[PDB]
C-alpha cells in the first residue's frame, strides 16, 4: 500500500504517489538492506507501470559497472520473475537482466521456443528483435557457449530480408570467422541459405564457402597460393583450416565407395603411408563418419557417412527404402495383432 513508501521516504531522506514512487526510485541507488530494494518490488508491481519501471531499471543497469553488481542482479532476478503476464517494456527489464548476465550468468531461461514465445507475444517488430538477439549474441559468446551461439547467430542472420541485407555486412563477416575459428562447426550449408550471403560476393569470406561445401582440397590448395594475405588477415590460421578440408574431401569420398582402399588418401589428401591411422580416428571421434579399418587386407570399410548438400536424388533414396519398410511393417502389424 501507500504507507510503505512513506517510511521509505523516511529511510532515504535520512540516509542520503507514482511520482512519489519514482522519487523514491531517485533516492536510493544514488546512495547505494535487501527489503529496501524488495519492498520497492512490493511497491512497483502492485499499481501505470511504464514510467516508474523505466526510471528504475535505468538506475539498476548503471550499477553493474560499479563495485558490487550482485545485489542489483539478485533483485532484478526477483523482478524479472515477477511480471510474467505481458509487457513490451519487459524487454527493457530483461535488457538489464542480460546486461547483468554478461557482466558476471546462466540461471536465466534462454530456450528457443521460449524466446519466440517472448518475441511473438511481446509482438514487437524485427528491429527490437534485432537488438534483443544481438544482446543475446555477445552475452552468449562471452560465457563459452559456442554451439548455442550459432543458433542465435543464424536467427540473427535469418531475421533479415532482401531489403535490409545492405546493413548485414559486419556480422556476415563475423559469423563465419568466429565459426572458422571453431574446428567443430561442421555445417556450412546453413551459412549459405541466408538472404544477405547470396547478395554478397567478391573477396569476402563467403567465397571460401563454395570452396568448402561442394568443392574439395584441389580447389583450396590453389587458393593458398593466391592469397597469403587475406585468409591470414582476419581471425584465421591456415593449418586448422587444412584439417577441416582434409575431412571434407575424405568424408565426401566416404559417402561414395564404402569399399575404399588406403592409397586414395595418400593421393587425394597428400600425406604419406603411416599418417592415415591416427587421422581415421579424428574422423570417427567427432560424429561425422563412423569408419573402420580392415588394416590387414588394406581396406577402409565404413559404416555410414554424412552429406554436405542434398538433392532430389537424396530424398529419393529415403523414399523407396522407407516405403517398403512401411510395407514390410504393414505385414507384421497385420500378423502380430491377429494372434490375440
Amino acid at each position: 500500500e501507500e504507507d510503505q513508501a512513506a517510511e521509505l521516504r523516511a529511510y532515504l531522506k535520512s540516509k542520503g504517489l507514482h511520482v512519489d514512487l519514482a522519487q523514491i526510485i531517485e533516492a536510493c541507488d544514488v546512495c547505494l538492506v535487501e527489503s529496501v530494494m524488495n519492498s520497492v518490488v512490493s511497491l512497483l508491481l502492485i499499481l501505470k507501470q511504464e514510467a516508474l519501471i523505466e526510471s528504475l531499471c535505468e538506475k539498476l543497469v548503471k550499477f553493474r559497472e560499479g563495485e558490487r553488481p550482485s545485489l542489483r542482479l539478485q533483485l532484478l532476478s526477483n523482478l524479472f520473475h515477477g511480471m510474467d503476464k505481458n509487457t513490451p517494456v519487459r524487454y527493457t527489464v530483461y535488457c538489464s537482466l542480460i546486461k547483468v548476465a554478461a557482466s558476471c550468468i546462466q540461471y536465466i531461461p534462454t530456450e528457443l521456443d521460449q524466446v519466440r514465445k517472448w518475441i511473438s507475444d511481446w509482438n514487437l517488430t524485427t528491429e527490437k528483435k534485432h537488438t534483443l538477439l544481438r544482446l543475446l549474441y555477445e552475452a552468449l559468446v562471452d560465457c563459452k557457449k559456442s554451439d548455442a551461439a550459432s543458433k542465435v547467430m543464424v536467427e540473427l542472420l535469418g531475421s533479415y530480408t532482401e531489403d535490409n541485407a545492405s546493413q548485414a555486412r559486419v556480422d556476415a563477416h563475423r559469423c563465419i570467422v568466429r565459426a572458422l575459428k571453431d574446428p567443430n562447426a561442421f555445417l556450412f550449408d546453413h551459412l549459405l541459405t541466408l538472404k544477405p550471403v547470396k547478395f554478397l560476393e567478391g573477396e569476402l569470406i563467403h567465397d571460401l564457402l563454395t570452396i568448402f561445401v561442394s568443392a574439395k582440397l584441389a580447389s583450396y590448395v590453389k587458393f593458398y597460393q593466391n592469397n597469403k594475405d587475406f585468409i591470414d588477415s582476419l581471425g584465421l590460421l591456415h593449418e586448422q583450416n587444412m584439417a577441416k578440408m582434409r575431412l571434407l574431401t575424405f568424408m565426401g569420398m566416404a559417402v561414395e565407395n564404402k569399399e575404399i582402399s588406403f592409397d586414395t588418401m595418400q593421393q587425394e589428401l597428400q600425406i604419406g603411408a603411416d599418417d592415415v591411422e591416427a587421422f581415421v580416428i579424428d574422423a570417427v571421434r567427432t560424429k561425422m563418419v563412423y569408419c573402420k579399418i580392415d588394416q590387414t587386407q588394406r581396406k577402409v570399410v565404413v559404416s555410414h557417412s554424412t552429406h554436405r548438400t542434398f538433392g532430389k536424388q537424396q530424398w529419393q533414396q529415403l523414399y523407396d527404402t522407407l516405403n517398403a519398410w512401411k510395407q514390410n511393417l504393414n505385414k507384421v502389424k497385420n500378423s502380430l495383432l491377429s494372434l490375440s
Partner: protein, 144 residues
C-alpha cells in the same frame, strides 16, 4: 592420468603417453619408493584399455603391428593378457595366426554380458549394433 586412461578415446596414443608417466615412476625408486609396488599393475590395465579402444574402430589388424605398438612386454606375455579380457569382461578380440591377423568384432552370434567396462567410448562393434537396432527406429522417429 584420468585424462588418458579413463576418459579419452585415443587408441594409438595410450601406449606411448601413459608409459611416459610410468617411466617417471621408474626414474626414482630411491627418492619416492612408495609408488613402486604399482609399477606392473597399471600395465595390466594398459593392454586391455587399448584393446577396449582399438576394437571399437578396427576390424582387422596384424599381430605384428601390435607387438611394435606396446614396447614394454614380449609377445607371449602379451598374448595371454589378450585372451582373458576377451573370454571374460566382454571384449571382441579374435586371433588368426595363418595370416597373423587379429579380428575385432566380426562374430554376429554374440550375446553381450552386463559386467563390461563402458569406458572411453565410440560406436561399438556390430554385435552390440545388430542387437538394439529396433530401438534406433523407435528413438529417432519420435524425435522426428
Amino acid at each position: 592420468l584420468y585424462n588418458w586412461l579413463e576418459v579419452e578415446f585415443n587408441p594409438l596414443k595410450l601406449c606411448e603417453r601413459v608409459t611416459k608417466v610410468l617411466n617417471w615412476v621408474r626414474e626414482q625408486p630411491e627418492k619416492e619408493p612408495e609408488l613402486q609396488q604399482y609399477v606392473p599393475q597399471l600395465q595390466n590395465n594398459t593392454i586391455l584399455r587399448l584393446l577396449q579402444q582399438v576394437s571399437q574402430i578396427y576390424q582387422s589388424i596384424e599381430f605384428s603391428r601390435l607387438t611394435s605398438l606396446v614396447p614394454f612386454v614380449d609377445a607371449f606375455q602379451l598374448e595371454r593378457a589378450i585372451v582373458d579380457a576377451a573370454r571374460h569382461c566382454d571384449l571382441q578380440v579374435r586371433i588368426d595366426h595363418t595370416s597373423r591377423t587379429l579380428s575385432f568384432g566380426s562374430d554376429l552370434n554374440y550375446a553381450t554380458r552386463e559386467d563390461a567396462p563402458i569406458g572411453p567410448h565410440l560406436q561399438s562393434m556390430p554385435s552390440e549394433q545388430i542387437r538394439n537396432q529396433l530401438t534406433a527406429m523407435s528413438s529417432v522417429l519420435a524425435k522426428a
